[PDB]
């Protein structure tokens, strides 16, 4: 279709200023598993959502940005303390990029075998990021929907687009399962999925970690599967 290959990664333009990055990691019982994040150009800078699985892959994301956009990466926000989302933090840091995560992600990252972000986000009781903790986030709208896939999972909308990113909270409309639930909050998951949908009620393109972009039926379907856990 429109997928651009760059080394071992894939880049898909979703909107004029927005690309999805995709990287892969072998896992037993699963094969080579895709993880998606985002790249957003905001004026004269670039914003990244999530690393790739590894430092090397993350450096390749930066190389793609250099080749295709050739503007500084002002910051990255990473959406929970798992390897697919934070595996590449040292590559961002080597590159001089300021990093942000949920406070709880930074607290958990060491024991997860991950490097913490440099800056912690905290969230109002209504789930919206406290805006003073997310300086220079431009069009990124960061929302904590409650515990679900993990206790620390956060989501991101993009102002001026029809896109909302569910990270590993949301699976596609035909997904057979919710994946590994080892760190999940099975009581709260369905509500958290629905809270994501309600935070971004206008988004028609739902982007997520482990499926291609889908309609909002991804949210309804994920929530319906999560209903079965409680
Ligand atoms: C390591 C990642 C973190 S979200 C994971 O748990 N995955 C990646 C694909 C599905 C699921 C699994 O192993 O069940
Ligand atoms: Zn995860
Ligand atoms: Zn994941």
Author numbering: 41 to 270
Copy out sentences from the published article reporting this entry, exactly as the authors wrote them:
The bacterial metallo-β-lactamases (MBLs) catalyze the inactivation of β-lactam antibiotics. Class B members, known as the metallo-β-lactamases (MBLs), are structurally distinct from the Class A, C, and D enzymes, require one or two zinc ions for catalytic activity, and are not inhibited by currently approved therapeutics. One variant of significance is NDM-4, first identified in 2012 (17). Although it differs from NDM-1 by a single amino acid substitution, namely M154L, it demonstrates increased enzymatic activity against the carbapenems and several cephalosporins.
This time, however, there were two monomers in the asymmetric unit. In both subunits of the NDM-4/l-captopril model, the region delineated by Leu 65 to Ala 72 adopts two distinct conformations, labeled A and B as shown in Figure 3A. In conformation B, Cζ of Phe 70 lies within 3.6 Å of a carboxylate oxygen of the l-captopril ligand. The sulfur of the ligand lies within 2.2. Å and 2.1 Å of Zn1 and Zn2, respectively. The bridging solvent in the apoenzyme model, as well as three additional waters are extruded from the vicinity of the binuclear metal center upon l-captopril binding. As a consequence, the coordination geometry surrounding Zn2 changes from octahedral to distorted tetrahedral shown in Figure 3C. In addition to its interaction with the binuclear metal center, the ligand also lies within hydrogen bonding distance to an ordered water molecule and the backbone amide nitrogen of Asn 220. The determined Ki for l-captopril was 164 μM and 210 μM with a corresponding LE of 0.37 and 0.36 against NDM-1 and NDM-4, respectively.
